[PDB]
Amino acid sequence: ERERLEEKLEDANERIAELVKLEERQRMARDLVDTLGQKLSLMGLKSDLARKLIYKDPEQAARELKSVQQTARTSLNEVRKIVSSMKGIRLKDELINIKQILEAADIMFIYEEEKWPENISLLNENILSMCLKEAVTNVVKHSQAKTCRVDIQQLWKEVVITVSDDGTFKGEENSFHGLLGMRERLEFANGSLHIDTENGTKLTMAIPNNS
């Protein structure tokens, strides 16, 4: 009887579990709306500057419009991939995943666990995940590293992930395509990428927690 009630509690907890998935999808959609909104404003501003510059400075006006096109192109490209499922890669899951890739590659995985980033958007998590996966894939294909260190830090208004390997960088002076892919999606989020290849390869990727 309570016997049978405890049953209904679990059916209830099971449906709450599925429903929470919808809630994460609702959160991802919201993140899309916020980002599309901001890019829409930015484009607004740049096209307005361009209009004010059509006579004063036509070449600068063409440059602003070219930045408008690029913003549009790359916004649609990042949303396109997400819109049907409204699901991305979680950072906890990717971190596990790259551990497994490193183990199969027999490259030692160094990770010191510290405060996990608390209030990161599903969009920005997906971006950082895809970048971490790309940085580590590269470690495995190209570095000949013996170790690979991942640091994930919640700094002030930003999350910074560092992937450092102690192999050798095999790219040219102008290796700028996984690498451009990373830079684009991070700059789309108002973040950044830095590469040091001086002794091993160090990628630092930074992304605002929100907007």
Added chain:
Amino acid sequence: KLEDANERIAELVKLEERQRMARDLVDTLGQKLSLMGLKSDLARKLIYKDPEQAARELKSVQQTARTSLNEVRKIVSSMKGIRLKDELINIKQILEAADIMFIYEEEKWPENISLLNENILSMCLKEAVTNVVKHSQAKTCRVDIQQLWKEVVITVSDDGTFKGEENSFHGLLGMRERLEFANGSLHIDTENGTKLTMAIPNN
């Protein structure tokens, strides 16, 4: 443990409609982003060939950006809008209170209309009928809701008298803006009574 479960399920189920409204915003914002992409590109191609036409396209880009953000702004937090079935009932009730005769011949209900576009049409219908009650002195108000080919058309016709000037273009501008946002339209005939036709694409 049990009581609270279904109280949590009872709300989280509401995400189903909210999740739909959010996809509708993402789709609309996407489209307006593309359209701004295209217009700014045409503007760029015209900087030297036709500067004044370039300026015009960029002004259209600004407008599109402004009004888009204005429509979304109101919906984003709640992700909830008015349903057309519920507004139809509501305007019945306003007309009854106003003692204006509500004429509605029921026909095929629009089947595949976006929540966003429903919310727009609802707010336009509510405005049209509010106006009927405040200004028309009509005895009848007829509302027609028609699924035409790729568009839904709602006609609100009263047999009172139009009290506005020649340039009454602010509920009316509100209507025209939000319908043009959705790629729809508004027409007013005030010849004998006031007739508003509002049209919006389904998706």
